[PDB]
Amino acid sequence: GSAAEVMKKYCSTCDISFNYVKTYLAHKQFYCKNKP
Numbered sequence: 001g002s003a004a005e006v007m008k009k010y011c012s013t014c015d016i017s018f019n020y021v022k023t024y025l026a027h028k029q030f031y032c033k034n035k036p
């Protein structure tokens, strides 16, 4: 068994998911609340 576990469509820090990858992109861009 490989310990891959993929999930590039869910911002754990925000606690949300996005079916569309484009959403996750635009999210981490300037939509995410991951302020410095």
Ligand SMILES: [Zn+2]
Pocket (backbone or CB within 6 Å): 011, 013, 014, 027, 028, 031, 032, 033, 034
């Ligand atoms: Zn986020």
